[PDB]
Design a protein around this ligand. Sequence first.
Ligand SMILES: O=P(O)(O)OC[C@H]1O[C@@H](O)[C@H](O)[C@@H](O)[C@@H]1O
Length: 352
Amino acid sequence: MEEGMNVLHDFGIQSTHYLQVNYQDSQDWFILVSVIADLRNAFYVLFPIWFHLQEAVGIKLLWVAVIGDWLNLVFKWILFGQRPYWWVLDTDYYSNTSVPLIKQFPVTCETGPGSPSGHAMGTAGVYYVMVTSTLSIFQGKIKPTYRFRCLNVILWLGFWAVQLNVCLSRIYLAAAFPHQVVAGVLSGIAVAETFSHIHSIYNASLKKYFLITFFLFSFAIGFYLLLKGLGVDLLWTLEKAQRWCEQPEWVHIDTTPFASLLKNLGTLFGLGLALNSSMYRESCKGKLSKWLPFRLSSIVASLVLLHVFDSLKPPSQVELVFYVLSFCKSAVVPLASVSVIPYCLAQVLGQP
Ligand SMILES: O=P(O)(O)OC[C@H]1O[C@@H](O)[C@H](O)[C@@H](O)[C@@H]1O
């Protein structure tokens, strides 16, 4: 079976080399694409706008993002994926021949397993959710049967253009293989379609949120400990993304599996706290609820303040402190977006 993996890996290496040699002028564009395709944006800028435009779409988007990322982490641990930027320097394949010369970039060195691709899955799920929601909302046009079809065609072309751009960006930076991005896209599509039939998430008590979060934490930690007690470790990539990196400062703690898990669980718990609170009821379910200026002000403030607040970086000297502070920091963005800032605007606008 290893021959097939070698064949796909060699095809990915050749694709990366061709893209890097024949299109040397597009490195800035692909770096920008990879930066934009981050889930940080999905949690910081995409969620507030959709939540303050239509609550159900925002809740669905956040749930899809968090659950898809958790499933991605679990399947990354299960599948034992690889990356080109250390495989090309570690493999025995290019022994009787010449090693292809692929170049590494500051946003290339990643400390997690390869398949499935996280960027492709995370972007596919969120953008499918947004496109489907928009198409569902706009079934009210003046002249139908050609204008609605025009909008449908335009949106479904844009979605696939975005997906192709993200796949090419991940391949160019020598961070993923061509099959991993396709698998990630299909998995994100499947997850976004599966959450279209689950309805016991829009009105859930804090007890259910707490139990779901604790189960998600405990399953991952128990999986890690159970495997660690049987002779296999799921953190083997931290020693491969360290020697095979051109510069030492390019390897960051922010991309480790524990950091991602803690951030996801913090976001979910923060949403659970924000939804079941007195401030949320007093602000988002009052007289200034559907008023357009209030919602626009909420979007603007929750964008500006969140952008400024993202500049507070927890210390990385001690790993446990970093993890707990990452959880606490990720638990705040739902809170500030949903409960606090709308409350402040409610006591500002309607209290003269
Ligand atoms: O492996 P990919 O597809 O290049 O993306 C990996 C990224 O996927 C994201 O889901 C994780 O939060 C990041 O920590 C990780 O770096």
